[PDB]
Amino acid sequence: DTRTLSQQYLDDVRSGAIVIEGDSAAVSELILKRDIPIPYSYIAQLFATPNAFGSGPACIICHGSNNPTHAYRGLNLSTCDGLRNGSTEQPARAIFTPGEDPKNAIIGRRLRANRMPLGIAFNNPTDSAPILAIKEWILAGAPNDEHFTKEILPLFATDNTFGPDTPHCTTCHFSNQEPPSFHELNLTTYEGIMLGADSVAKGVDNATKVIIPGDPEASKVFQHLTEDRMPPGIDPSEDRDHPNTQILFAWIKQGAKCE
Amino acid sequence: DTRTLSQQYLDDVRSGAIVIEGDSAAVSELILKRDIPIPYSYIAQLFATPNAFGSGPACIICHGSNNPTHAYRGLNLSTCDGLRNGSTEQPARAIFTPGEDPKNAIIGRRLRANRMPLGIAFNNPTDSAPILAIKEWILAGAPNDEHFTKEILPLFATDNTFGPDTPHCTTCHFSNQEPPSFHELNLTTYEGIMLGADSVAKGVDNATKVIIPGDPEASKVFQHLTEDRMPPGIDPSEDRDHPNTQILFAWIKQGAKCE
Amino acid sequence: DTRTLSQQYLDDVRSGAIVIEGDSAAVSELILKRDIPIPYSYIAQLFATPNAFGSGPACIICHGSNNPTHAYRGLNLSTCDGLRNGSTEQPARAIFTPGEDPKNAIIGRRLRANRMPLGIAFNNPTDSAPILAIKEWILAGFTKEILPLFATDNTFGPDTPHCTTCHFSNQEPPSFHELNLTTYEGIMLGADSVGVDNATKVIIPGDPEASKVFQHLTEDRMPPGIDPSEDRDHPNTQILFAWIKQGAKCE
Ligand code: HEC
Ligand code: HEC
Ligand code: HEC
Ligand code: HEC
Ligand code: HEC
Ligand code: HEC
Ligand SMILES: [Cu+2]
Ligand SMILES: [Cu+2]
């Protein structure tokens, strides 16, 4: 106990414990690192203010109610209870779990995860023929059979597969070396797809699995194929590590408290 | 219909009914088109936040009371009731009518209509001699008589008429061909003035009469001469179709409900 | 005199009393000039909103409480009484005085005074060897121990220009705010000597805290890491000062 915020700051400026890289810095090093408590009052404002996590209309316009005709998915982001409840319209689901890191919970993917193939517009269907094919393949336990090789593998290497005028996934995900291949993810072979991302620069048994056999809902490929970044139409190049995103995550790790 | 937002959406991307042009898109096709209900809470934030409709101070600073010594025109934009009442200081007048399209109501012109001649500074009087002349000419039924040709017609073709270092209207409004004449409006002759704008590339059925004989208050000419765009000093080139404006308009058409 | 806001305006467009220079103008000529009353409701929104005075996180995040372990300096900017009270943590002190101009008060300096040397990062210490050397000299009311620090590169932190880089002459361009930091007299005369006997005094002997030099050396502009070139006369700053001068009223 006992040592003040001011006291640690004076000590950390002294030790060089504060590192400054593309500030931002004020937030990572003085707010998150020292685990300062975030009031719901600030979070409420975030969901209610246009451009709060990146370019686009305020979240509560489209998600301002638990009535599915007044709000998409009957998701009410405008109150603390509404946030904690998540989507109401069938199929109902929480968009995060209080006290747990939401980085990969639904609210996190919707704020940070660009839909794939990178740049594809939201008015392309998320239940098209190929997506549904990939879905069934994952359900099937993600087999390396004849069917996969002829009917599934080329989806990652063929132009205009998931919408008009879009590049094959293989354009950007084709090796295990970062530069030039993003997240060290290789989608050219079965072996590469099941291996997943970040397999070199951070373990190989600690790879970020991108297909989870039997569970399409949790498979990062399927998610990126079917989930549009919010607010709809946001440009993929907008900061995925926006301070407001981070502060929101912090408030959730702290218990998503209502005061 | 009794169909939910989500359902309308999954149906609209499939059919291709969603058109994307320079977002904007999220707002026009998902918010306005689907007739989503706008809460007063958001509107309040619009009038209380600086730069909400384009660059400048928050509206409620200058319009925060029905007491004419605390607020210009005794106009209170800070409460729902204040909005509905409008300007209180004599001459008292509503600034919109609940349930009616406000695009050309007082609130609409003050957000979207740049004062003419374009760019003229707001510290130029709005009751100068030329304006009053034009006012009276419209009161008289806008005759094409001897008087008009001599005393009124040149007011649109003479530099520095409505203020210092301002170009003649005739600089930008001189034919019915857009490029080069703005809004296809011609102020060089009586015939052109009564004809009005937008009569050509979209026909005589999208014509916009710009002088309404017997009513200066309703004549778009008189309006542009006397009404400074808000907040004062806002650059003419600021988006005249700001999303928050479009949302403000929507809330008014829905009835300006206070919850 | 008993004319409404609207009436004063019409008289002022007519009189030419309204002057427009790089707007900005609406707030200086219509809000501040006519002393429109500023509501606390707006002021609260200012401390609660990110980027309200320039780039950076909202003030009430780091200063949201009178508990020095939940808010820096035990300063609560999130309530009206919190504001008036100021810093709770020792040394406890108010950050402004209601009814008095706050421009060079603590809240004003933190909004408007870029830390020196210009551009210096906030993770550089403010009780380092050179600065502490200087603190005692002002307390004392020389040439070898104090003076050279203003013409020396990398004095107060790594990769920083010597103060003399920007303050080396008598008039404005190329010397900012007409201040010359190379000699004893230029330092005691102060800035804006072109002045010359009402020049903005920059050192107050016996009082480090009111000496503008000590202030700029030890006080980081808020929010921390804000780029020095961000408008130092932000309209929201000006409105806040207006609210303080009006009595810092809570209703
Ligand atoms: C309309 C203009 C929207 C705005 C503004 C925001 N979102 Fe949204 N959201 C919108 C649609 C059409 C959908 C898909 C609906 C469907 O039935 O498929 C979504 C989806 C979400 C979700 C996921 C819902 C779920 O998994 O059950 C989330 C978590 C979400 N949106 C959040 C969100 C946030 C945080 C926003 C502001 C930054 C935001 N949305 C804006 C439409 C619109
Ligand atoms: C470049 C033009 C790309 C194409 C084509 C595809 N993706 Fe992509 N991917 C790209 C980037 C820049 C990123 C990083 C995140 C960001 O939005 O900037 C990603 C990431 C993924 C991931 C997540 C990886 C993780 O470690 O969590 C997945 C699962 C993914 N990409 C899959 C994927 C698929 C299936 C694609 C084709 C349909 C595809 N990507 C195309 C860039 C590009
Ligand atoms: C002062 C700094 C102002 C700010 C900020 C805004 N407005 Fe304003 N407004 C101001 C003046 C000096 C005037 C004209 C006064 C006169 O006596 O003629 C106006 C006028 C309006 C009106 C017209 C109402 C009428 O009855 O004629 C409207 C509807 C209006 N202003 C709205 C408005 C909005 C929406 C603002 C924010 C975007 C806004 N004003 C800012 C002074 C100031
Ligand atoms: C160019 C430098 C212009 C001068 C000089 C004047 N106006 Fe104009 N006007 C201009 C533009 C670009 C527009 C479109 C709206 C915008 O703000 O960008 C207009 C519009 C009008 C209108 C309304 C037209 C409509 O379709 O409703 C009117 C009635 C009008 N302008 C009249 C007008 C008068 C009387 C002028 C001289 C005092 C004048 N304009 C100058 C560009 C320019
Ligand atoms: C953390 C991320 C902060 C944000 C956001 C803001 N400020 Fe701050 N402030 C912060 C620190 C680390 C310090 C120094 C602490 C120390 O012990 O020296 C300060 C200091 C101030 C002060 C001075 C208080 C005093 O007693 O002298 C003031 C008046 C101040 N800060 C105000 C302020 C404002 C107005 C902010 C938003 C615009 C703001 N701070 C943001 C940390 C952080
Ligand atoms: C530029 C490269 C600078 C260096 C190096 C130093 N200062 Fe400076 N100073 C600079 C500017 C552009 C300004 C104007 C205000 C602003 O923040 O932009 C200032 C201001 C001061 C003042 C106050 C002047 C006044 O009229 O009140 C002081 C007292 C001051 N600066 C002192 C100072 C010291 C002690 C420096 C080195 C240790 C120093 N300055 C370096 C630009 C630059
Ligand atoms: Cu302890
Ligand atoms: Cu029906």
Q: Which residue has the tokens 């498979």?
A: A219
Inspect the interface and report whether the beta carbons of A36 and C225 lie closer than 8 Å. Answer: no
The CA–CA distances, whole Å, from A48 to A45, A63, A66, B204 equal 5, 10, 16, 43
What is the distance between the alpha carbons of residues B50 and C45, in angstroms, rounded to a whole number? 11
What is the distance between the alpha carbons of residues A249 and B189, in angstroms, rounded to a whole number? 64
Ligand nearest to the CA of B2: 8
* Ligand 3 nearest-atom number relative to CA B93: 26
What is the distance between the alpha carbons of residues A182 and B59, in angstroms, rounded to a whole number? 46
Cβ-contact B148, B140 below 8 angstroms: no
Inspect the interface and report whether the beta carbons of C61 and A3 lie closer than 8 Å. Answer: no
Give backbone dihedrals phi and psi of C76, rounded to 5 degrees, phi first.
Answer: -100, 95
Are residues B109 and B144 part of one domain?
Answer: no
Which residue type is seen at B21? E
Nearest C-alpha of chain A: how many angstroms from C39? 20
Are residues C214 and C119 part of one domain?
Answer: yes
CB-neighbour burial class of residue B254 (10 A; exposed 0-12, middle 13-18, buried 19+): middle
Partners of residue B18 in chain A, C-beta under 8 Å = 123
Nearest C-alpha of chain B: how many angstroms from C239? 9
Residues whose CB is less than 8 angstroms from the CB of residue B109 and which lie 6 or more positions away in sequence, other chains included: B223, B227
The CA–CA distances, whole Å, from A35 to A103, A244, A252, B155, B238 equal 17, 15, 12, 67, 41
Q: Which of B12, B231, B240 is nearest to A122 (CA)?
A: B12
Residue nearest to atom 1 of ligand 5 (CA): C62
Residues forming beta bridges with residue C200, ordered by sequence position? C191
Phi-psi region of B22 (alpha: psi -120 to 50; beta: other; left: phi over 0): left
Are residues B160 and B68 part of one domain?
Answer: no
Residues forming beta bridges with residue A186, ordered by sequence position? A174
What is the distance between the alpha carbons of residues A235 and A55, in angstroms, rounded to a whole number? 8
- Kindly state whether A93 is in contact with chain B, defined as any CB-CB distance less than 8 angstroms: no
Are residues C167 and C190 part of one domain?
Answer: yes
Residues whose CB is less than 8 angstroms from the CB of residue A154 and which lie 6 or more positions away in sequence, other chains included: none
The helix-helix angle for B40-48 and A40-48 (nearest 10°) equals 90
What is the distance between the alpha carbons of residues B173 and B192, in angstroms, rounded to a whole number? 10
The method of structure determination was: X-ray
- Which contiguous run of DSSP H or E holds residue C150? none
Name the domain count of chain A. Answer: 3
CA B99 to ligand 5 centroid distance, Å: 47
Ligand nearest to the CA of C233: 6
Provide the 3-class DSSP secondary structure of residue B118. coil
Question: What dihedral do alpha carbons C28, C31, C35, C40 form, nearest 10°?
Answer: -120
* Ligand 1 nearest-atom number relative to CA B9: 12
CB-neighbour burial class of residue B90 (10 A; exposed 0-12, middle 13-18, buried 19+): exposed
Residues whose CB is less than 8 angstroms from the CB of residue C12 and which lie 6 or more positions away in sequence, other chains included: B123, C18
Q: Which residue has the tokens 């982001």?
A: A77
Provide the 3-class DSSP secondary structure of residue B87. strand
- Number of helices and strands in chain B (H, E): 11, 0
CB pairs under 8 A between A and C: 67
**Tokens representing A135?**
């879905």
Cβ–ligand 4 distance for B224 under 6 Å, the answer yes
Q: String of b and e for C58-78 (b: at least 16 CB within 10 Å)?
A: bbbbbbbbbebbbbbbbbbbb
CB-neighbour burial class of residue C83 (10 A; exposed 0-12, middle 13-18, buried 19+): buried
Cβ-contact A43, A251 below 8 angstroms: yes
Which residue type is seen at B81? D
Alpha carbon C139 to chain centroid, angstroms: 23
Q: Which of C80, C87, C171, C159 is nearest to C117 (CA)?
A: C159
Nearest CA in chain B to C16: B123
Are residues C96 and C30 part of one domain?
Answer: no
The CA–CA distances, whole Å, from B169 to B107, B139, B144, B157, B187 equal 25, 21, 19, 6, 7
Are residues C134 and C184 part of one domain?
Answer: yes
Residue C105 DSSP label = S
Alpha carbon C126 to chain centroid, angstroms: 17
What is the distance between the alpha carbons of residues B232 and C25, in angstroms, rounded to a whole number? 9
- Kindly state whether C61 is in contact with chain A, defined as any CB-CB distance less than 8 angstroms: yes
Task: List the resolution, Å.
Answer: 2.7
HSE-CB for B130 with a 13 A CA cutoff: 22
What is the distance between the alpha carbons of residues A60 and A49, in angstroms, rounded to a whole number? 8
**Tokens representing B128?**
């100068």
The helix-helix angle for A40-48 and C40-48 (nearest 10°) equals 90
**Tokens representing C220?**
């980081």
3-state SS of C24-87 is CHHHHHHHHCCCCCCCHHHHHHHHHCCCCCCCCCCHHHHCECCCCCCCHHHEECCCHHHHHHCE
Are residues B221 and B201 part of one domain?
Answer: yes
Are residues B142 and B196 part of one domain?
Answer: yes
Cβ-contact C244, C233 below 8 angstroms: no
**Tokens representing A65?**
């109610």
* Ligand 1 nearest-atom number relative to CA B7: 17
Residues forming beta bridges with residue C113, ordered by sequence position? none
Cβ-contact A70, A64 below 8 angstroms: yes
Cβ-contact C204, B19 below 8 angstroms: no
Other Cβ atoms less than 10 A from the Cβ of A18: the count is 20
Partners of residue A62 in chain B, C-beta under 8 Å = 5, 30-31, 36
What do you get for the CA distance between the two ends of chain A, in Å? 23
Give backbone dihedrals phi and psi of C33, rounded to 5 degrees, phi first.
Answer: -60, -40
CB-neighbour burial class of residue B160 (10 A; exposed 0-12, middle 13-18, buried 19+): exposed
Per the structure, the complete domain to which residue B17 belongs is given by 1-35
Cβ–ligand 2 distance for A224 under 6 Å, the answer yes
Residue B217 DSSP label = G
What do you get for the CA distance between the two ends of chain B, in Å? 23
- Kindly state whether A250 is in contact with chain C, defined as any CB-CB distance less than 8 angstroms: no
Residue-level length of chain B: 259
Q: Which of B71, B7, B42 is nearest to B252 (CA)?
A: B42
Cβ-contact C194, C178 below 8 angstroms: yes
Are residues A233 and A105 part of one domain?
Answer: yes
Are residues A256 and A215 part of one domain?
Answer: no
Q: Which residue has the tokens 């603390």?
A: A80
Residues forming beta bridges with residue B208, ordered by sequence position? B197
HSE-CB for A91 with a 13 A CA cutoff: 3
Are residues A134 and A205 part of one domain?
Answer: yes
Cβ-contact A45, A57 below 8 angstroms: no
Other Cβ atoms less than 10 A from the Cβ of C116: the count is 21
What is the distance between the alpha carbons of residues C120 and A16, in angstroms, rounded to a whole number? 15
Other Cβ atoms less than 10 A from the Cβ of A241: the count is 10
| DSSP per-residue string spanning chain A | ----HHHHHHHHHHHT----SSS-HHHIIIIITTTPPPPHHHHHHHHHSTTSSSSSS-HHHHSB-SSTTTSGGGBBTTSHHHHHH-B-SSSPB-S--TTS--TTSHHHHHHH---TTTT--TTS-SS-HHHHHHHHHHHTT---SHHIIIIIGGGGT-TTSSSTT---GGGT-B-SSTTTSGGG-B-SSHHHHHH-BS-STT-SSS-B-S--TT-GGG-HHHHHHH-PPTTTT--TTS-TT-HHHHHHHHHHHTT----
Residue of A46, A59, A84 to mutate, ligand 1, most atoms within 8 A of C-beta: A59
Dihedral of alpha carbons A107, A111, A116, A120, sign: positive
Are residues A120 and A141 part of one domain?
Answer: yes
Nearest CA in chain C to A22: C225
